[PDB]
Scaffold this motif. Structure first.
Motif, PDB file in Angstrom:
ATOM      1  N   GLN A 164       0.799  -1.212   0.068  1.00 53.00           N
ATOM      2  CA  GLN A 164      -0.075  -0.049   0.043  1.00 53.00           C
ATOM      3  C   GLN A 164       0.924   1.227  -0.061  1.00 53.00           C
ATOM      4  O   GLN A 164       0.446   2.113  -0.481  1.00 53.00           O
ATOM      5  CB  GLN A 164      -0.919   0.078   1.220  1.00 53.00           C
ATOM      6  N   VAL A 165       2.085   1.111   0.474  1.00 56.46           N
ATOM      7  CA  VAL A 165       3.097   2.364   0.502  1.00 56.46           C
ATOM      8  C   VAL A 165       3.232   2.850  -0.722  1.00 56.46           C
ATOM      9  O   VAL A 165       3.341   3.796  -0.841  1.00 56.46           O
ATOM     10  CB  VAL A 165       4.051   2.088   1.393  1.00 56.46           C
ATOM     11  N   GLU A 166       3.352   1.911  -1.680  1.00 57.72           N
ATOM     12  CA  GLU A 166       3.808   2.242  -3.039  1.00 57.72           C
ATOM     13  C   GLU A 166       2.554   3.147  -3.805  1.00 57.72           C
ATOM     14  O   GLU A 166       2.970   4.243  -4.481  1.00 57.72           O
ATOM     15  CB  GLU A 166       4.220   1.233  -3.817  1.00 57.72           C
ATOM     16  N   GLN A 167       1.381   2.783  -3.546  1.00 58.33           N
ATOM     17  CA  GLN A 167       0.335   3.680  -3.932  1.00 58.33           C
ATOM     18  C   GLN A 167       0.098   4.887  -3.387  1.00 58.33           C
ATOM     19  O   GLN A 167       0.138   5.798  -4.212  1.00 58.33           O
ATOM     20  CB  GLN A 167      -1.043   2.658  -3.622  1.00 58.33           C
ATOM     21  N   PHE A 168       0.351   5.072  -2.314  1.00 56.68           N
ATOM     22  CA  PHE A 168       0.380   6.483  -1.496  1.00 56.68           C
ATOM     23  C   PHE A 168       1.544   7.329  -2.026  1.00 56.68           C
ATOM     24  O   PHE A 168       1.594   8.436  -2.669  1.00 56.68           O
ATOM     25  CB  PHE A 168       0.664   6.201   0.030  1.00 56.68           C
ATOM     26  N   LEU A 169       2.840   6.848  -2.229  1.00 54.55           N
ATOM     27  CA  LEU A 169       3.925   7.289  -2.915  1.00 54.55           C
ATOM     28  C   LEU A 169       3.773   7.910  -4.362  1.00 54.55           C
ATOM     29  O   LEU A 169       3.942   8.873  -4.853  1.00 54.55           O
ATOM     30  CB  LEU A 169       5.051   6.216  -2.896  1.00 54.55           C
ATOM     31  N   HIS A 170       2.816   6.931  -4.940  1.00 50.81           N
ATOM     32  CA  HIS A 170       2.273   7.546  -6.380  1.00 50.81           C
ATOM     33  C   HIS A 170       1.601   8.492  -6.185  1.00 50.81           C
ATOM     34  O   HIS A 170       1.572   9.341  -7.083  1.00 50.81           O
ATOM     35  CB  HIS A 170       1.713   6.126  -6.988  1.00 50.81           C
ATOM     36  N   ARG A 171       0.744   8.552  -5.370  1.00 49.04           N
ATOM     37  CA  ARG A 171      -0.229   9.542  -5.263  1.00 49.04           C
ATOM     38  C   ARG A 171       0.624  11.000  -4.955  1.00 49.04           C
ATOM     39  O   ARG A 171       0.426  12.062  -5.481  1.00 49.04           O
ATOM     40  CB  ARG A 171      -1.193   9.565  -4.197  1.00 49.04           C
ATOM     41  N   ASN A 172       1.633  10.890  -3.986  1.00 49.54           N
ATOM     42  CA  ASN A 172       2.390  12.063  -3.563  1.00 49.54           C
ATOM     43  C   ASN A 172       3.291  12.555  -4.839  1.00 49.54           C
ATOM     44  O   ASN A 172       3.546  13.398  -4.975  1.00 49.54           O
ATOM     45  CB  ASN A 172       3.603  11.551  -2.369  1.00 49.54           C
ATOM     46  N   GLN A 222       2.170  12.124  -7.865  1.00 47.44           N
ATOM     47  CA  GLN A 222       1.148  13.101  -8.749  1.00 47.44           C
ATOM     48  C   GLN A 222       1.064  14.353  -8.070  1.00 47.44           C
ATOM     49  O   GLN A 222       0.960  15.443  -8.847  1.00 47.44           O
ATOM     50  CB  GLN A 222      -0.280  12.371  -8.574  1.00 47.44           C
ATOM     51  N   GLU A 223       1.019  14.582  -6.829  1.00 44.44           N
ATOM     52  CA  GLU A 223       1.161  15.808  -6.196  1.00 44.44           C
ATOM     53  C   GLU A 223       2.240  16.635  -6.507  1.00 44.44           C
ATOM     54  O   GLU A 223       2.452  17.869  -6.849  1.00 44.44           O
ATOM     55  CB  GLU A 223       0.723  15.655  -4.570  1.00 44.44           C
TER      56      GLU A 223
END
Length: 96
Positions: free
Chosen positions: A68-76, A78-79
């Motif tokens: 799950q950390v990788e998905q949040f990192l991908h969102r970051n 994008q930001e």
């Protein structure tokens, strides 16, 4: 495995340095000792199955949750790209 060695060492001492009144009275004690040693060895053997059962689940949940950390990192990421991009336009509509 070491339990059997300890049990044999304990049992042998009964005769190595002593001469009990009757031999037949020692074998009953040896049988009771074997009962208890079997109990302890059974517990030791049982530990391993539970340990493997816990390990498999622990590894599976580690792998699943850690992803799950990788998905949040991908969102970051994008930001980060959005901030690198310059804003424009929409402010005028909001102020109107």
């Amino acid at each position: 495995q070491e339990l059997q060695q300890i049990h044999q060492y304990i049992m042998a001492l009964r005769e190595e340095y002593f001469d009990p009144s009757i031999v037949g009275w020692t074998v009953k004690y040896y049988e009771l000792e074997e009962k208890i040693v079997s109990l302890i060895k059974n517990l030791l053997v049982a530990l391993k199955d539970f340990h493997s059962e816990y390990i498999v689940s622990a590894s599976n949940f580690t792998s699943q949750l850690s992803s799950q950390v990788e998905q949040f990192l991908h969102r970051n990421i994008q930001e980060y790209l959005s901030i690198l991009t310059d804003p424009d336009g929409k402010g005028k509509e909001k102020i109107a």
